[PDB]
Amino acid sequence: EVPSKESIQGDATQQSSKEENTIITRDQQQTVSENIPSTVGDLVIASSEPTQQFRSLTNRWMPINSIRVTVNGKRNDLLAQYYIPEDFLSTHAKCAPNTIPFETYVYGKYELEMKFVANGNKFQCGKVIISVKFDSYQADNINTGFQAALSRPHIMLDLSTNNEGVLKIPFRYHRAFVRNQTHKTATAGVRPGKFASIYVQVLSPLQTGEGGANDMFIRPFYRYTRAEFAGMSYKVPLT
């Protein structure tokens, strides 16, 4: 919150977040989205049998693929986008222990937390925005601008300061549960594994000095704050 004078290990006034068997530190301040509620009450009706949590597996931090930001990138350009949970099961971090319960259970409710860590130098500058769109299936190509991102739950990343960002994502879906996996025997009438979309977009282009670096990198990390699974079945490979 307040910096100190320089010592052997610089300004040693870092903060950190410990979740299960994973720790992530931060050198500067962090921005955090509002803690907002999910749909509750339908759980007990939708599933006759009780739902299960596996906090040790699911509630740990897991890094996903690296994002490169360049000076060529213009405002409104998608740096990356994620259909969740699908892309965290069968695209990013496929060997993560977070994905183990999705092999056996067919349904679930999912509240996520996504931390973003940027590393640009002090002679660079730029703005990136990350936002969430709830129940985005067949509505990804509309309300998908920087302006829509600023309206929806979001976090803002300055590329010079390297402030961290934490997006809290509730479960807001038009059904009681989301389907975890497609299967050859299962119906194709319902799109599974997608209750929301995450967009990483350029708000202001990356700029650099004379003979400076023409790019810098951002790393997302995800965890489930509340992952309740329902409908046990035989284990299958993910997608």
Binding site: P63, S66, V117, A118, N119, G120, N121, K122, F123, Q124, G209, E210, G211, G212, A213, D215, M216, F217, I218, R219
Partner: peptide
């Protein structure tokens, strides 16, 4: 995780 990006 994030590539080292020091000033020139």
């Amino acid at each position: 995780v994030n590539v080292l990006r020091p000033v020139a």
